[PDB]
């Protein structure tokens, strides 16, 4: 198996034409900005997630409701979510943001973020932005189809393809 | 021989400027979606193809007219067509589609799909989408010309070029 | 020296930001299509070129005024021009075209094609398309400047850069 | 750690989706064109820079106020600026330009060029163009955030990422 561009599509007989239009997308949400990740407290209560495995409510203990504490409690809850704190200089005074993302891509792995219930915080936490889970969009011999993940065993029979990047308008030739 | 980008154009004395605008395209058609590829039967009769080698009619035996059976019978017919079943999550309830493609690219290798004649199926099969065969479009020193295949022995004299991907607006420099 | 993308810019201390907007372009002209390159004769006389080295008139001998003969006579004239015959399937009946290009890029290496004087041909030859010589356009720390060739010793002091492809909007980081 | 495209993002466990929308930009200014870099004198006085470290005034000695002399005096001043002379064929008669750039990227590393005070020059020097310092723009799981530099230790926890090129619309998959 050879890909015309392993940095768009790689894998492990015929002439196969594949275009990666969009990668599959994880559902995700990003907080408003905070001036620090280790002092300003967001309060006590819970954050609600609606997931393919049902409603999940992650309990935020005032003990440690800094952005860092909340990230660690979301990760320790093991509810199909991965949290991290990122720095976004769009607001230089409030650069720190909580990013929470599903672990799976595809329309069927949707996560929503419908409620943050928190009392006594130093500052309001909210998800300023969210993104829905999405399928990959790929073209096979010019036909756009949707895939749940960034891999396929069906497009090139006998090969497992992994999409490495989205490159709309950059059709790649593969051979086997 | 060196290509400025082997993942757009590679091959096996001068300064050669080549842009791959569009890869050469196989003629192809893709079915409507089915809920499965191994149970729902499309019926008995035939599927008609108009090819550069003349009219071809592939006989679909009710014995095995699942999408999988039809794919196997199209391939076994040896009429210049390659069939496979793909999964397209655009319709989650009916994800399975038959993709049928010519083996050759270029305007002169046209295939059309003018008739599906099938009685007693569980569900209607039809080609929801088709694509015409097309030439590659490449620019040599800025002039767009058309090629039948994704290779050339004429653009860089003494070298066989293979186009690995389309990259419109990305002129590549080659040397020999 | 390291380039962030050797397939856009490569070469042989600091942080250097380079974008290749357009490669430098050779002046060139391409004929109308012919049904063959080895039988149909274009006649006797000459083809005129205006070059940076002055007016050049290449004499076409009726002995061999096929597209192939003309290509060989232009090359043998040694007037700063390189000719080849390409196949362009835009007109399937008349696919063969003469491509004539200058050997140098840049605005100062302009070539024009102002006259074809040919009597007794089987078919009219003319330059259906021509292209002017052009400078490369590159951005250095965001400023677009023009270069005569697809190389530079000035952009990154102490290094000779060779532009491998044009990639407008794809700023590359280089280090030394 | 593996990047789907090391020529966009490289570095040194999870599924990480990163798009480099724009590289971080150095503040910079480029002069008008001069016919030479080693004879035409721009005069005596100073060039003013406003920098994050305060107002800096670089003294231009008539002894050597060629574009080359000025470049060398700006570099020898050690005021957070790097100067070089580039050749820009946009004006073939006046191709030589002084490019002066900050050493740091990001909104907080702004440099402006508010005054050139020079008497007795052969020709006027001025900054025909300038560019403000800017943050990198990157998307993490589809959310655009701003970074001061072309690196990050926060996007992929436990890895130092270096952005090698901007590739808007080309989301890259990374793994750890």
XYZ file of C-alpha atoms in Angstrom:
704
model
C 0.000 0.000 0.000
C 1.214 3.496 -0.989
C -0.438 6.866 -0.356
C 0.352 9.783 -2.680
C 0.476 11.864 0.532
C 0.996 10.066 3.854
C 0.483 13.391 5.692
C -3.129 13.489 4.484
C -4.043 9.815 4.352
C -1.900 6.808 5.274
C -2.653 3.165 5.952
C -1.531 -0.456 6.293
C -5.241 -4.064 -5.864
C -6.278 -0.845 -7.604
C -6.299 2.923 -8.117
C -8.087 4.727 -5.314
C -8.984 8.437 -5.268
C -9.549 9.855 -1.770
C -10.071 13.394 -0.608
C -10.271 14.233 3.115
C -12.737 17.157 3.167
C -13.118 17.415 6.974
C -11.789 15.363 9.848
C -14.309 13.794 12.205
C -14.874 16.230 15.134
C -15.202 15.616 18.886
C -17.991 17.431 20.720
C -16.408 20.143 22.910
C -16.929 23.320 24.931
C -14.586 26.073 26.052
C -14.980 28.362 29.052
C -14.780 32.125 29.392
C -11.313 33.461 30.293
C -9.893 33.597 33.822
C -6.980 35.628 35.123
C -5.339 32.539 36.610
C -5.908 28.789 36.753
C -4.855 28.192 40.344
C -6.448 30.870 42.592
C -9.767 32.233 41.276
C -12.475 29.864 42.423
C -15.577 29.073 40.350
C -17.670 27.804 43.276
C -19.326 24.607 44.471
C -22.073 22.559 42.865
C -21.950 20.672 39.588
C -21.510 20.806 35.828
C -24.045 18.892 33.697
C -23.157 16.961 30.546
C -25.620 15.178 28.235
C -23.802 12.252 26.670
C -24.523 9.186 24.537
C -24.216 7.222 27.821
C -26.862 9.473 29.445
C -26.906 12.529 31.661
C -23.701 13.039 33.629
C -23.354 15.523 36.473
C -19.790 16.201 37.678
C -19.642 17.486 41.265
C -17.432 20.518 41.862
C -16.076 20.655 45.358
C -15.327 24.150 46.712
C -12.149 22.610 48.189
C -10.578 23.019 44.801
C -12.693 24.813 42.203
C -9.847 26.631 40.473
C -9.813 25.993 36.700
C -7.071 23.510 37.437
C -9.135 21.762 40.184
C -12.176 21.545 37.960
C -10.151 20.136 35.108
C -8.725 17.473 37.464
C -12.240 16.581 38.873
C -13.765 16.315 35.359
C -10.923 14.013 34.336
C -11.180 11.936 37.572
C -14.960 11.555 37.124
C -14.332 9.254 34.125
C -17.556 10.312 32.320
C -16.198 10.149 28.721
C -14.767 13.686 28.864
C -11.193 15.042 28.788
C -10.553 18.479 30.256
C -7.535 20.719 29.971
C -6.760 24.346 30.682
C -5.516 26.372 27.721
C -4.134 29.908 27.507
C -5.811 32.220 24.991
C -4.256 35.671 24.596
C -7.385 37.120 22.914
C -8.030 38.568 26.418
C -4.537 39.202 27.885
C -5.996 39.953 31.351
C -8.082 36.698 31.335
C -6.134 34.233 29.268
C -6.930 30.902 31.004
C -9.778 28.746 29.650
C -11.201 25.348 30.458
C -11.584 23.156 27.370
C -13.754 20.053 27.782
C -13.985 17.563 24.874
C -15.664 14.186 24.256
C -13.315 11.286 23.607
C -15.167 10.147 20.428
C -15.827 11.801 17.117
C -18.899 11.391 14.889
C -22.525 12.518 14.906
C -23.521 9.644 17.098
C -21.085 10.635 19.882
C -22.757 13.962 20.645
C -22.140 15.746 24.026
C -23.963 18.899 25.111
C -23.246 21.274 27.972
C -26.667 22.498 29.122
C -26.131 23.649 32.699
C -23.442 24.915 35.060
C -24.782 25.168 38.624
C -22.266 26.837 40.946
C -22.720 28.954 44.050
C -20.218 31.198 45.864
C -17.643 31.495 43.058
C -15.182 34.394 42.789
C -16.121 34.591 39.149
C -18.766 33.169 36.814
C -17.775 30.123 34.749
C -19.617 29.444 31.567
C -19.038 27.755 28.244
C -18.583 30.776 25.905
C -18.300 28.406 22.962
C -19.279 24.835 22.135
C -18.926 22.510 19.137
C -21.056 19.547 18.123
C -19.564 16.169 17.323
C -19.281 15.622 13.563
C -18.602 12.944 11.031
C -15.567 13.007 8.762
C -16.366 13.985 5.215
C -14.393 12.208 2.556
C -14.715 11.790 -1.153
C -14.188 8.419 -2.765
C -13.892 8.618 -6.565
C -15.483 12.083 -6.205
C -18.458 11.078 -4.025
C -18.665 12.708 -0.601
C -19.581 10.256 2.162
C -19.569 10.560 5.928
C -17.571 8.459 8.365
C -17.856 8.368 12.182
C -14.078 8.241 12.826
C -10.809 9.335 11.185
C -10.158 5.863 9.896
C -11.730 3.397 7.474
C -11.452 -0.257 6.553
C -14.155 0.168 3.789
C -12.748 2.734 1.330
C -9.757 0.695 0.211
C -10.687 -2.957 0.710
C -8.007 -4.834 2.670
C -6.451 -1.698 4.134
C -6.973 0.312 7.296
C -6.794 4.009 6.368
C -6.007 6.698 8.967
C -6.796 10.297 8.012
C -3.839 12.472 9.135
C -5.206 15.896 8.095
C -8.128 17.567 6.337
C -7.234 18.929 2.901
C -10.346 20.016 1.102
C -9.794 20.160 -2.683
C -6.637 18.006 -2.477
C -7.598 14.644 -3.913
C -4.899 12.039 -3.126
C -4.161 8.952 -5.202
C -3.563 5.693 -3.289
C -2.380 2.340 -4.674
C -2.426 -1.317 -3.546
C 15.218 13.800 -11.590
C 13.967 15.774 -8.554
C 10.451 17.023 -7.801
C 10.007 20.039 -5.513
C 7.105 18.044 -4.011
C 7.020 14.268 -4.536
C 3.580 14.147 -2.851
C 2.116 16.185 -5.716
C 4.193 15.042 -8.672
C 6.980 12.452 -8.746
C 8.734 10.571 -11.518
C 11.662 8.505 -12.801
C 17.950 18.643 -18.479
C 16.018 21.748 -17.434
C 13.676 23.737 -15.195
C 10.112 22.484 -15.398
C 7.060 24.189 -13.865
C 4.096 21.852 -13.300
C 0.829 22.412 -11.522
C -1.647 19.547 -11.006
C -5.023 21.335 -11.196
C -7.241 18.206 -11.172
C -6.493 14.509 -11.228
C -7.934 12.463 -14.074
C -11.321 11.039 -12.918
C -12.887 7.590 -13.383
C -16.539 7.450 -14.419
C -18.582 6.226 -11.422
C -22.014 5.886 -9.824
C -23.153 5.416 -6.245
C -26.380 3.825 -5.039
C -29.009 5.008 -2.589
C -28.458 3.860 1.017
C -29.472 0.457 2.386
C -29.892 -0.613 5.989
C -27.596 -3.601 5.491
C -25.410 -5.106 2.777
C -26.154 -8.766 3.414
C -29.941 -9.228 3.869
C -32.058 -6.657 1.996
C -32.472 -7.920 -1.539
C -32.633 -5.619 -4.576
C -34.320 -8.152 -6.877
C -33.615 -10.069 -10.074
C -32.945 -8.783 -13.569
C -30.009 -6.715 -14.759
C -28.049 -3.483 -14.498
C -27.103 -1.737 -17.767
C -23.777 0.003 -18.370
C -22.795 1.942 -21.510
C -19.043 1.647 -21.905
C -16.313 2.452 -24.429
C -16.383 -1.303 -25.225
C -20.154 -1.117 -25.894
C -23.336 -1.801 -23.981
C -22.877 -4.151 -21.037
C -25.755 -5.719 -19.130
C -24.847 -7.426 -15.832
C -27.371 -10.081 -14.776
C -28.523 -9.944 -11.159
C -29.557 -13.301 -9.841
C -32.190 -13.259 -7.070
C -30.107 -16.007 -5.409
C -27.895 -13.284 -4.065
C -29.030 -9.728 -4.778
C -27.882 -8.214 -1.493
C -25.611 -5.181 -2.021
C -22.765 -7.552 -1.310
C -24.022 -10.131 -3.885
C -24.468 -7.480 -6.534
C -21.022 -6.084 -5.904
C -19.553 -9.603 -6.276
C -21.547 -10.285 -9.547
C -20.508 -6.920 -11.078
C -16.884 -7.702 -10.257
C -17.162 -11.314 -11.572
C -18.755 -10.092 -14.827
C -15.393 -8.568 -15.856
C -17.015 -5.717 -17.859
C -14.426 -2.987 -17.040
C -16.132 -2.044 -13.755
C -15.065 -2.356 -10.098
C -17.772 -2.408 -7.444
C -17.515 -2.032 -3.703
C -19.914 -1.379 -0.860
C -19.194 1.714 1.221
C -20.753 2.982 4.450
C -22.043 6.562 4.402
C -23.362 7.909 7.708
C -25.257 10.787 6.022
C -28.288 8.477 6.542
C -27.515 6.541 9.768
C -30.496 4.194 9.218
C -29.404 3.425 5.590
C -25.655 3.722 5.555
C -24.648 1.053 2.984
C -24.081 2.103 -0.644
C -22.925 0.382 -3.794
C -20.148 2.292 -5.564
C -19.412 1.232 -9.147
C -16.434 2.824 -10.969
C -14.746 2.427 -14.374
C -11.163 1.202 -14.289
C -9.868 4.003 -16.594
C -9.767 7.747 -16.266
C -10.097 10.330 -19.056
C -12.862 11.720 -21.257
C -12.497 8.889 -23.689
C -13.180 6.222 -21.028
C -16.740 7.344 -20.310
C -19.251 4.951 -18.589
C -22.929 5.761 -18.082
C -25.538 4.036 -15.947
C -28.804 4.420 -17.875
C -31.019 1.618 -16.592
C -31.550 -0.633 -13.582
C -34.173 -3.301 -14.335
C -35.054 -5.309 -11.220
C -38.245 -7.046 -10.161
C -39.283 -8.372 -6.733
C -36.726 -6.465 -4.633
C -37.231 -5.690 -0.934
C -36.128 -2.179 -1.725
C -35.480 -0.025 -4.793
C -31.858 0.284 -5.940
C -30.871 3.272 -7.958
C -27.799 5.343 -8.669
C -28.491 8.502 -6.585
C -25.297 10.038 -7.925
C -22.992 9.563 -10.901
C -19.765 11.149 -12.161
C -18.416 11.384 -15.692
C -14.902 10.320 -16.586
C -12.562 13.314 -16.861
C -9.140 14.263 -18.054
C -6.428 15.485 -15.705
C -5.827 19.196 -15.908
C -2.250 20.286 -15.534
C -0.355 23.445 -16.209
C 3.017 23.346 -17.902
C 4.872 26.677 -17.716
C 1.457 28.187 -16.869
C -0.535 26.645 -19.744
C -3.412 24.365 -18.769
C -3.567 21.187 -20.856
C -5.581 18.011 -20.494
C -4.222 14.501 -20.068
C -6.154 11.198 -20.178
C -4.308 9.597 -17.222
C -2.476 10.629 -14.035
C 0.878 10.172 -15.675
C 2.870 11.697 -18.526
C 5.965 10.943 -20.557
C 5.525 14.239 -22.573
C 5.724 17.071 -20.012
C 9.296 16.440 -18.918
C 11.045 14.758 -21.844
C 12.854 11.580 -20.760
C 10.856 11.170 -17.561
C 7.672 9.357 -16.618
C 5.687 11.629 -14.281
C 3.027 10.244 -11.911
C 0.593 12.752 -10.405
C 0.184 11.885 -6.688
C -2.407 14.546 -5.750
C -4.305 17.526 -7.142
C -3.093 20.855 -5.761
C -4.675 23.684 -7.658
C -2.649 26.913 -7.302
C 0.455 25.032 -6.086
C 2.920 25.170 -8.948
C 5.802 22.716 -8.343
C 9.318 23.084 -9.716
C 10.955 19.927 -11.127
C 14.563 19.465 -12.277
C 16.498 17.000 -14.475
C 19.691 25.603 8.336
C 16.194 24.075 8.671
C 13.051 24.840 6.666
C 9.642 24.182 8.240
C 8.695 22.810 4.793
C 11.485 21.754 2.418
C 8.872 21.125 -0.315
C 8.054 24.846 -0.374
C 11.397 26.426 0.453
C 14.732 24.710 1.098
C 18.314 25.913 1.231
C 21.949 25.432 2.251
C 21.191 32.893 13.128
C 17.505 33.747 13.517
C 13.783 33.207 12.959
C 12.786 33.803 9.358
C 9.210 33.951 8.032
C 8.913 33.276 4.288
C 5.884 32.799 2.109
C 6.240 31.826 -1.569
C 3.258 33.599 -3.181
C 4.172 32.882 -6.835
C 7.139 31.230 -8.480
C 9.120 33.263 -10.991
C 7.682 32.554 -14.493
C 9.408 31.963 -17.845
C 8.002 33.765 -20.880
C 6.278 31.175 -23.110
C 3.861 30.532 -25.972
C 1.836 27.505 -27.002
C 0.576 26.641 -30.476
C -2.853 25.664 -31.740
C -3.502 21.897 -31.835
C -2.388 19.576 -34.637
C -3.620 16.096 -35.458
C -0.079 14.716 -35.461
C 3.455 15.910 -34.756
C 5.246 14.054 -37.533
C 3.268 14.455 -40.803
C 1.250 17.693 -41.015
C 3.590 20.381 -42.266
C 3.390 24.019 -41.139
C 5.307 25.440 -44.115
C 8.543 27.274 -44.858
C 9.712 30.683 -43.704
C 10.479 31.802 -40.172
C 9.215 32.380 -36.648
C 10.113 35.705 -34.986
C 11.034 36.076 -31.317
C 11.758 39.358 -29.503
C 14.205 38.606 -26.717
C 16.365 40.432 -24.173
C 19.279 39.618 -26.535
C 17.408 41.262 -29.451
C 15.212 40.138 -32.309
C 15.654 36.483 -33.233
C 14.232 34.926 -36.385
C 14.310 31.107 -36.547
C 14.235 29.759 -40.113
C 11.769 26.948 -40.783
C 12.865 24.697 -43.577
C 10.060 22.975 -45.520
C 12.282 19.858 -45.452
C 10.983 19.215 -41.986
C 8.271 21.583 -40.769
C 6.283 19.025 -38.793
C 5.706 20.131 -35.176
C 8.545 17.802 -34.316
C 10.861 19.333 -36.991
C 10.078 22.847 -35.861
C 10.707 21.967 -32.249
C 14.099 20.476 -33.226
C 15.048 23.581 -35.370
C 14.051 26.021 -32.578
C 16.176 24.040 -30.133
C 19.129 23.792 -32.598
C 18.987 27.555 -33.271
C 20.281 28.200 -29.723
C 18.407 31.537 -29.377
C 17.562 31.258 -25.631
C 14.402 29.211 -26.269
C 13.438 25.605 -25.446
C 10.713 23.965 -27.510
C 8.796 20.777 -26.910
C 5.667 19.179 -28.296
C 2.943 18.430 -25.758
C -0.333 16.526 -26.086
C -3.466 18.363 -24.947
C -6.702 16.360 -25.033
C -8.897 19.503 -24.875
C -9.228 18.896 -28.658
C -9.033 15.082 -29.070
C -8.795 15.384 -32.885
C -5.925 17.963 -32.644
C -4.057 17.138 -29.486
C -0.442 18.038 -30.415
C 0.898 21.495 -29.492
C 4.225 23.250 -29.755
C 5.291 24.853 -26.472
C 8.144 27.367 -26.688
C 9.563 28.833 -23.440
C 12.399 31.212 -22.491
C 15.160 29.706 -20.380
C 15.062 32.527 -17.759
C 12.398 33.739 -15.399
C 11.793 37.319 -14.224
C 10.387 40.532 -15.681
C 13.694 41.412 -17.212
C 13.864 38.175 -19.249
C 10.800 38.931 -21.368
C 10.234 37.103 -24.735
C 7.421 37.948 -27.146
C 6.144 36.056 -30.168
C 5.021 38.751 -32.619
C 5.106 37.064 -36.017
C 4.907 33.651 -37.666
C 5.658 33.906 -41.399
C 5.050 30.591 -43.174
C 3.980 29.788 -46.714
C 2.669 26.518 -48.188
C 1.754 24.790 -44.907
C -0.834 22.000 -44.674
C -2.251 23.834 -41.708
C -1.893 27.228 -40.028
C 0.432 27.415 -37.013
C -0.101 30.142 -34.512
C 0.508 30.806 -30.848
C -3.036 30.450 -29.394
C -1.693 31.416 -25.986
C 1.328 33.228 -24.574
C 2.617 34.136 -21.105
C 4.895 36.971 -20.049
C 7.979 36.404 -17.939
C 7.344 37.255 -14.281
C 9.144 37.794 -11.039
C 8.663 35.529 -8.038
C 6.550 37.062 -5.325
C 7.584 36.247 -1.805
C 6.785 37.631 1.582
C 9.515 38.194 4.127
C 8.163 38.905 7.625
C 4.851 39.668 5.861
C 6.199 42.076 3.216
C 5.713 41.043 -0.407
C 8.808 41.616 -2.546
C 9.704 40.530 -6.052
C 12.644 38.373 -7.076
C 13.899 37.627 -10.615
C 14.583 33.907 -9.982
C 13.346 31.060 -7.759
C 16.285 31.436 -5.442
C 17.705 34.034 -3.064
C 20.894 34.698 -1.151
C 19.368 37.920 0.402
C 16.307 36.779 2.388
C 18.169 34.635 4.896
C 21.686 36.055 5.138
C 24.330 33.341 4.703
C 21.975 30.894 3.009
C 21.019 30.160 -0.576
C 17.251 29.556 -0.675
C 15.601 27.611 -3.521
C 11.827 27.948 -3.872
C 10.406 24.448 -4.555
C 6.715 25.385 -4.963
C 4.306 28.312 -4.732
C 2.027 28.144 -1.692
C 0.139 31.369 -1.324
C -1.133 31.844 2.255
C 1.269 29.206 3.640
C 3.903 31.125 5.555
C 6.870 28.845 6.389
C 9.205 29.281 9.345
C 12.941 28.803 8.673
C 15.788 28.682 11.212
C 19.592 29.098 11.160
C 4.474 11.802 19.926
C 3.442 11.798 16.237
C 2.161 14.683 14.111
C -0.013 13.926 11.073
C 2.066 16.631 9.336
C 5.461 17.553 10.809
C 5.775 20.370 8.228
C 2.810 22.150 9.826
C 3.162 21.198 13.477
C 5.852 19.066 15.118
C 6.927 18.507 18.700
C 8.757 16.471 21.345
C -2.001 10.186 25.744
C -4.791 11.154 23.348
C -6.192 12.392 20.036
C -5.412 16.047 19.443
C -6.834 18.199 16.629
C -4.732 21.279 15.817
C -5.016 23.781 13.023
C -2.385 26.512 12.552
C -4.455 29.422 11.182
C -1.704 32.090 11.311
C 1.843 32.084 12.596
C 2.745 34.595 15.288
C 4.129 37.745 13.559
C 7.093 39.990 14.424
C 6.550 43.746 14.259
C 8.452 45.092 11.222
C 8.946 47.966 8.783
C 10.403 48.162 5.295
C 11.976 51.178 3.616
C 11.375 52.780 0.241
C 13.643 51.498 -2.558
C 17.191 52.716 -3.201
C 19.292 52.337 -6.324
C 22.178 50.856 -4.343
C 22.957 49.804 -0.779
C 26.544 51.013 -0.603
C 26.761 54.554 -2.079
C 23.542 56.583 -1.734
C 23.587 58.164 1.695
C 20.445 58.711 3.787
C 21.956 61.396 6.038
C 22.832 61.950 9.687
C 20.584 62.024 12.730
C 18.538 59.189 14.175
C 15.754 56.668 13.678
C 13.170 56.334 16.478
C 11.655 53.033 17.599
C 8.933 52.594 20.242
C 9.446 49.212 21.857
C 8.155 47.166 24.793
C 11.445 48.143 26.511
C 10.700 51.852 25.888
C 11.642 54.468 23.333
C 14.829 53.673 21.433
C 16.634 56.168 19.218
C 19.367 54.735 16.963
C 21.965 57.326 15.928
C 22.860 57.410 12.237
C 26.346 58.653 11.621
C 26.923 60.383 8.262
C 30.239 58.475 8.147
C 28.300 55.518 6.881
C 24.608 56.124 6.212
C 24.318 53.870 3.172
C 21.504 51.305 3.545
C 24.239 48.863 4.432
C 25.748 51.226 7.079
C 22.370 51.872 8.633
C 21.578 48.188 8.763
C 24.927 47.552 10.513
C 24.354 50.446 13.050
C 20.795 49.255 13.859
C 22.137 45.755 14.460
C 25.110 47.043 16.547
C 22.783 49.202 18.680
C 21.342 46.021 20.258
C 17.865 47.566 20.802
C 15.791 44.393 20.130
C 15.767 44.942 16.351
C 17.310 43.003 13.440
C 17.933 44.852 10.189
C 18.776 43.528 6.763
C 18.821 44.905 3.247
C 16.620 43.088 0.742
C 16.287 43.453 -3.029
C 12.765 44.020 -4.358
C 12.404 44.123 -8.145
C 8.975 45.836 -7.983
C 11.031 48.987 -8.782
C 13.945 47.743 -10.953
C 15.705 51.144 -10.752
C 15.398 51.235 -6.900
C 15.465 47.648 -5.772
C 17.276 47.887 -2.395
C 15.201 48.137 0.802
C 15.949 48.216 4.497
C 13.855 45.717 6.462
C 13.803 46.187 10.241
C 12.012 43.572 12.402
C 11.482 42.971 16.139
C 13.008 39.790 17.517
C 9.762 38.671 19.263
C 6.338 37.793 17.984
C 2.991 38.380 19.722
C 0.724 41.330 20.482
C 2.670 42.167 23.575
C 5.959 42.588 21.661
C 4.784 45.549 19.587
C 7.345 47.899 17.880
C 6.387 51.087 16.047
C 8.436 53.294 13.751
C 7.157 56.829 14.379
C 9.994 59.094 13.273
C 13.015 59.199 10.976
C 15.049 62.375 11.560
C 17.838 62.737 8.992
C 19.506 65.788 7.497
C 21.734 66.088 4.410
C 20.836 62.750 2.784
C 21.215 62.083 -0.950
C 17.756 60.604 -0.834
C 14.821 60.423 1.579
C 14.515 57.254 3.676
C 11.154 56.314 5.014
C 9.268 53.219 6.064
C 6.871 52.724 3.096
C 5.305 49.785 4.902
C 5.041 48.500 8.462
C 3.456 45.497 10.193
C 2.255 45.134 13.766
C 3.317 42.253 15.969
C 0.625 39.563 16.143
C -0.318 36.476 18.047
C -0.477 33.052 16.428
C -3.989 31.851 15.798
C -4.560 28.169 16.284
C -7.575 25.976 16.639
C -7.690 23.267 19.264
C -10.601 20.847 18.776
C -12.088 23.564 16.525
C -11.723 26.509 18.935
C -9.539 29.386 17.761
C -7.206 30.685 20.472
C -4.284 33.079 20.370
C -0.705 32.331 21.357
C 2.197 34.798 21.744
C 4.812 32.551 20.066
C 5.012 29.767 17.461
C 5.250 27.127 20.129
C 3.105 25.733 22.936
C 3.477 23.498 25.959
C -0.312 23.848 26.764
C -2.164 22.443 23.730
C -0.884 18.889 24.025
C -0.046 18.340 27.692
C 3.469 16.926 28.132
C 4.669 18.026 24.704
C 6.373 21.114 23.338
C 4.770 21.936 19.974
C 6.567 24.065 17.357
C 4.438 25.493 14.545
C 6.384 25.035 11.267
C 3.916 26.736 8.882
C 0.483 28.353 8.747
C -2.114 26.217 6.970
C -5.532 27.700 7.436
C -8.277 25.092 6.874
C -5.822 22.179 7.249
C -6.615 20.599 10.590
C -3.831 18.167 11.607
C -4.273 15.149 13.859
C -1.576 14.569 16.511
C -1.156 11.556 18.814
C 0.668 10.780 22.088
